[PDB]
Amino acid sequence: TSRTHTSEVHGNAEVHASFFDIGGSVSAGFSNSNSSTVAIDHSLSLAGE
Amino acid sequence: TSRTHTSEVHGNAEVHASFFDIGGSVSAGFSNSNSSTVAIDHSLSLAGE
């Protein structure tokens, strides 16, 4: 089994360019995650000599 | 065999600075994924000492 925890910072930057319109943009953000993997495995090995 | 639950929490933020039509959007997020992953392996080895 595996349980995780993530952090993140986000950003964006885009300005406008038209015949009349100008602009600008900034941002933020914090993202996380909680992944719960439950892995069930089986194996076989048949060796000879 | 593996069946994975990946829960997510998240926070989001955007803005668009302009003259008078300035737009902003802070936000968040919540998500899960029910990912059932199987994997079938067949292998070999030929060792000689």
Swiss-Prot record, chains A, B:
Domain of life: Bacteria
Membrane topology qualifier: Multi-pass membrane protein
Disulfide bonds: none
Transmembrane feature ranges: 8-19, 22-31
Location within or outside the cell: Host cell membrane; Host endosome membrane
Reported impact of residue 21 to A: Decrease in toxicity probably due to slow translocation of LF
Annotated site location: Cleavage: 20-21
Summary of subunit composition and partner proteins: Homooligomer; homooligomerizes to form homoheptamers (PA-63(7)) or homooctamers (PA-63(8)). PA-63(7) or PA-63(8) form ring-shaped oligomers that are in a pre-pore conformation, which do not penetrate the host membrane. PA-63(8) displays an enhanced stability, suggesting that this form circulates in the blood to reach and exert toxicity even in distant tissues. Interacts with lethal factor (LF) and edema factor (EF); can bind LF and EF simultaneously and interaction takes place following homooligomerization on the host cell membrane.
Its job: Mature form that oligomerizes and forms a pore to translocate the enzymatic toxin components edema factor (EF) and lethal factor (LF) into the host cytosol. Following attachment to host cell receptors and cleavage by FURIN, homooligomerizes to form ring-shaped oligomers that are in a pre-pore conformation, and associates with EF and LF. Toxin-leaded complexes are then endocytosed in a clathrin-dependent process, followed by a conformational change of oligomerized PA-63 from the pre-pore to pore state, which is triggered by the low pH in the endosome.
Domain notes: To pass through this hydrophobic restriction, substrate proteins LF and EF need to be unfolded prior to translocation.
Stated name of the protein: Protective antigen PA-63
Record organism: Bacillus anthracis
Source taxonomy: Bacteria, Bacillati, Bacillota, Bacilli, Bacillales
